[PDB]
Design a protein around this ligand. Sequence first.
Ligand SMILES: *[C@@H]1O[C@H](CO)[C@@H](O[C@@H]2O[C@H](CO)[C@@H](O[C@@H]3O[C@H](CO[C@H]4O[C@H](CO)[C@@H](O)[C@H](O)[C@@H]4O)[C@@H](O)[C@H](O[C@H]4O[C@H](CO)[C@@H](O)[C@H](O)[C@@H]4O[C@H]4O[C@H](CO)[C@@H](O)[C@H](O)[C@@H]4O)[C@@H]3O)[C@H](O)[C@H]2NC(C)=O)[C@H](O)[C@H]1NC(C)=O
Ligand SMILES: *[C@@H]1O[C@H](CO)[C@@H](O[C@@H]2O[C@H](CO)[C@@H](O)[C@H](O)[C@H]2NC(C)=O)[C@H](O)[C@H]1NC(C)=O
Ligand SMILES: *[C@@H]1O[C@H](CO)[C@@H](O[C@@H]2O[C@H](CO)[C@@H](O)[C@H](O)[C@H]2NC(C)=O)[C@H](O)[C@H]1NC(C)=O
Ligand SMILES: *[C@@H]1O[C@H](CO)[C@@H](O[C@@H]2O[C@H](CO)[C@@H](O)[C@H](O)[C@H]2NC(C)=O)[C@H](O)[C@H]1NC(C)=O
Ligand SMILES: *[C@@H]1O[C@H](CO)[C@@H](O[C@@H]2O[C@H](CO)[C@@H](O)[C@H](O)[C@H]2NC(C)=O)[C@H](O)[C@H]1NC(C)=O
Ligand SMILES: *[C@@H]1O[C@H](CO)[C@@H](O)[C@H](O)[C@H]1NC(C)=O
Ligand SMILES: *[C@@H]1O[C@H](CO)[C@@H](O)[C@H](O)[C@H]1NC(C)=O
Ligand SMILES: *[C@@H]1O[C@H](CO)[C@@H](O)[C@H](O)[C@H]1NC(C)=O
Ligand SMILES: [Ca+2]
Ligand SMILES: [Ca+2]
Ligand SMILES: [Ca+2]
Ligand SMILES: [Ca+2]
Ligand SMILES: [Ca+2]
Ligand SMILES: [Mg+2]
Lengths: 441, 10, 349
Amino acid sequence: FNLDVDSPAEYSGPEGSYFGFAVDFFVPSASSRMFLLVGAPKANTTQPGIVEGGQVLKCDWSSTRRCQPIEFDATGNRDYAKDDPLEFKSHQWFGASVRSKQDKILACAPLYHWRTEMKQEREPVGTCFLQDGTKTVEYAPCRSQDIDADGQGFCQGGFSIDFTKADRVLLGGPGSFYWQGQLISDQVAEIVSKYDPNVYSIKYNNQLATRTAQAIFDDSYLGYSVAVGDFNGDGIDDFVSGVPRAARTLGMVYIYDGKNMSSLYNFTGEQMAAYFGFSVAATDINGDDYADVFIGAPLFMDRGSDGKLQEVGQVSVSLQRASGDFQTTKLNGFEVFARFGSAIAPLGDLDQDGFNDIAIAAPYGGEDKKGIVYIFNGRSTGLNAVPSQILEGQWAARSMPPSFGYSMKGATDIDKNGYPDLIVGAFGVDRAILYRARPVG
Amino acid sequence: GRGDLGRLKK
Amino acid sequence: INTQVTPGEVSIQLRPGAEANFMLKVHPLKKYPVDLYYLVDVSASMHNNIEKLNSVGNDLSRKMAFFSRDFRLGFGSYVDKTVSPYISIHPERIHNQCSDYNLDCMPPHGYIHVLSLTENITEFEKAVHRQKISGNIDTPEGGFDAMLQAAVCESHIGWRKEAKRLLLVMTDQTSHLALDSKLAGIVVPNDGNCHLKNNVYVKSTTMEHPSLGQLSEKLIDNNINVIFAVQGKQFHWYKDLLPLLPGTIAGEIESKAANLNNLVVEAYQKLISEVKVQVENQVQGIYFNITAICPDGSRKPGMEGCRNVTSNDEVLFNVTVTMKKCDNYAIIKPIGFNETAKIHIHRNC
Ligand SMILES: *[C@@H]1O[C@H](CO)[C@@H](O[C@@H]2O[C@H](CO)[C@@H](O[C@@H]3O[C@H](CO[C@H]4O[C@H](CO)[C@@H](O)[C@H](O)[C@@H]4O)[C@@H](O)[C@H](O[C@H]4O[C@H](CO)[C@@H](O)[C@H](O)[C@@H]4O[C@H]4O[C@H](CO)[C@@H](O)[C@H](O)[C@@H]4O)[C@@H]3O)[C@H](O)[C@H]2NC(C)=O)[C@H](O)[C@H]1NC(C)=O
Ligand SMILES: *[C@@H]1O[C@H](CO)[C@@H](O[C@@H]2O[C@H](CO)[C@@H](O)[C@H](O)[C@H]2NC(C)=O)[C@H](O)[C@H]1NC(C)=O
Ligand SMILES: *[C@@H]1O[C@H](CO)[C@@H](O[C@@H]2O[C@H](CO)[C@@H](O)[C@H](O)[C@H]2NC(C)=O)[C@H](O)[C@H]1NC(C)=O
Ligand SMILES: *[C@@H]1O[C@H](CO)[C@@H](O[C@@H]2O[C@H](CO)[C@@H](O)[C@H](O)[C@H]2NC(C)=O)[C@H](O)[C@H]1NC(C)=O
Ligand SMILES: *[C@@H]1O[C@H](CO)[C@@H](O[C@@H]2O[C@H](CO)[C@@H](O)[C@H](O)[C@H]2NC(C)=O)[C@H](O)[C@H]1NC(C)=O
Ligand SMILES: *[C@@H]1O[C@H](CO)[C@@H](O)[C@H](O)[C@H]1NC(C)=O
Ligand SMILES: *[C@@H]1O[C@H](CO)[C@@H](O)[C@H](O)[C@H]1NC(C)=O
Ligand SMILES: *[C@@H]1O[C@H](CO)[C@@H](O)[C@H](O)[C@H]1NC(C)=O
Ligand SMILES: [Ca+2]
Ligand SMILES: [Ca+2]
Ligand SMILES: [Ca+2]
Ligand SMILES: [Ca+2]
Ligand SMILES: [Ca+2]
Ligand SMILES: [Mg+2]
């Protein structure tokens, strides 16, 4: 209820760049300053001969709204031989996903293609670049020798990423093994030390990765979204990922142990084609020090009063318990075709009750389908199922809908007033908006 | 088969 | 005025806390002019199946002469969106996706309209005969997008408002869902409009597939009675979506495709033997309670309607309208029928 909607800070990028497709906070903490990280997957860059490569921008908060691209990569395409490009950075969608731990920044290009050594191909392997302060290192786990539609050739690694508490990267590639999907995790210290610009398939010793399964699991899209939290009580963050096309398109969410990538818990959707698993988030919402799972099903259709189905969307709120189980509560959308549950951003304790809150977005809801964000507060019982606040998109539709709330991030007190804030991205109008929690420091 | 062209492959 | 659904227009009065009711009658007639469009999956997985379309011309017309006033046929095809990761975009494989396997495969396309609905069966036979196979990589194929385009493009396909519209979708694989398109970077929701320029669906590469709710809405808005003809084990996938898609049938193509005409005739018989209604209740503060008095005497909840209906036989829908609050008209239509009942509702508050 205490998010300042009167005077939110506004950030804008180049038109059509999808600026705001991914949002995050950058808090180096070796320097006291604060920044916003905004991904612009379709932005034009200065790379030689690259068109719509993408960008990740670092945006100031202190009395200005200027943004500067992060120079992850300035080179064009490397060449495998004379008149034989190794790779194709054009339309690579760099900055579609952005993550930042303390001083590190991980940003990825899911639609990056490359030509394998064996033959002249175009394999959508996807690539990531890890900035670790002074150093910048490329991380492309899914581009390797064993690549095809059969292998990791179509992996699109970096489609979704996250940072583990103990400094590992979690990376999901929905496309590997005929779109069975895959998760890959490796330690940052190993990523930055094993990097060699001249080796196109770098090997990582302590890398954890899920493997090939039966043919029945094809087109499951494991790695569509990822999240991390401790779920088996050993203090090491476990890997939560959505598998929206699993179980004959019912959708699924897997939890793999972070120590060895061993499967722990499975969730399954209850309506076909609802995309159970489009969005996934993990936080302790009821304040019992156990992480709780949030799963979005933006295409869920609900039986109305007349018996007519209405596509309102759904978010499953699953509270973890000490017994090693969960208690699930279904949170339905409020408008038809608004896609409630597209984004699920934990807020921390937005108002400092001692109970964390969570934000859920319906990017095509509200007046004129401008997009709407719902704020839900935490309680000892669970999540208060009545939105304590409504956030409405302000920008009108251009050629494509504004999509306010498509990407969002919170749980950072950017203004150092003691209360976590929230950033919301509207890539349809190339906007990012910061909402600052008012005091109830 | 796997993929649309798996039928041709087989 | 209405031939099947009577009364076609109703005017009632209401006051807050009060109620009203009237009886709606839906009466199928003996013979319907039939428009049947053959939307085919021309991907590389349907190579053994496409050659069997030559048999769905003369024989199907002679079969359907007994159940239709007149019978029309049309042809159309789809494979998938022509972007990575769905197709291989290497310049050799981009336009001949079967290059490695050395087949004369046509370039892949989203949805091509081949032949408008016509009473000349020879045109359909020849258009079917000349049609060849295309290809792509992943197994799921863009059935729903081509389905929506066929349903919404009236003047292009040639749907008659007087006809019992049938849209047959023939495939062997699951279809792509709305949010599958994010892998290609396509993050623009489908608008549900028509975009056939030169009989080709041009916006297949720039906006995502429709969702089941959107497809159902646009199918029922256009009175399209969809028949799914599916060959493999993926038939049950479509059969399980029927509860989510009112007014849709699914039939199994036998492995040799020998039952493709009996499939159509059986599906049409099932279609014309079922009456079920829904209400477009956009009137604020007014709620409807419709119960179907089936001819056998059952009291079904209306939304599901009644089955085994014939001509010389009327289904009666008992409509009870309640006012709860206040701030127009509502439309009760039997899905798959070309007539609707418009309930104009006056009131004072
Ligand atoms: C959450 O939900 C997911 C999805 O349902 C689930 O993951 C799946 O788990 C199952 C079981 O753990 C995986 O299925 C297979 O398990 C067998 C185990 O083999 C034993 O059991 C079978 C039972 O039929 C016996 O037949 C067999 O003899 C053993 O006794 C593994 O062997 C499987 O891997 C093989 O197949 C893969 C694909 O062919 C190969 O890539 C792999 O290298 C293995 O190859 C061997 O078997 C081949 C069989 O054809 C053979 O040809 C080879 O030569 C070689 O011998 C596979 O693991 C399934 O893959 C999982 N799928 C996913 C997507 O994760 C989770 O368990 C569940 N978690 C929770 C907590 O509920
Ligand atoms: C990035 O720059 C390129 C040019 O380097 C732009 O390309 C234009 O693309 C449109 C179609 O999308 C064409 O109609 C124009 O003719 C192209 N321009 C040129 C100069 O070739 C591209 O639109 C730019 N993209 C963004 C997001 O800014
Ligand atoms: C129905 O279409 C067929 C062709 O699809 C027509 O038959 C052709 O007629 C032309 C003359 O107009 C001949 O030159 C061709 O040899 C015929 N082809 C075949 C296969 O018969 C037929 O005339 C059309 N019928 C109507 C009523 O329009
Ligand atoms: C609904 O469909 C029926 C069945 O075709 C239509 O009735 C026919 O209408 C045409 C004119 O469009 C007449 O020439 C036929 O004689 C009618 N046949 C019968 C058996 O009545 C009816 O007009 C359609 N109504 C609407 C509103 O589309
Ligand atoms: C159609 O519905 C109306 C109600 O809207 C039915 O009329 C009521 O029937 C019940 C049970 O017999 C009585 O208790 C009520 O007094 C009747 N009137 C009202 C205003 O509720 C009517 O019987 C139904 N018709 C059929 C054929 O089922
Ligand atoms: C994976 O690690 C967990 C945590 O120590 C352990 O309980 C489990 O047995 C391990 N499984 C495998 C297959 O190593
Ligand atoms: C409709 O009437 C039935 C009784 O036949 C009742 O159970 C139901 O609650 C009613 N619903 C509405 C929306 O009026
Ligand atoms: C279907 O309806 C006809 C006509 O009333 C009747 O003769 C027949 O027995 C019915 N069939 C079933 C299975 O109820
Ligand atoms: Ca753990
Ligand atoms: Ca908890
Ligand atoms: Ca709180
Ligand atoms: Ca604050
Ligand atoms: Ca396909
Ligand atoms: Mg196919």
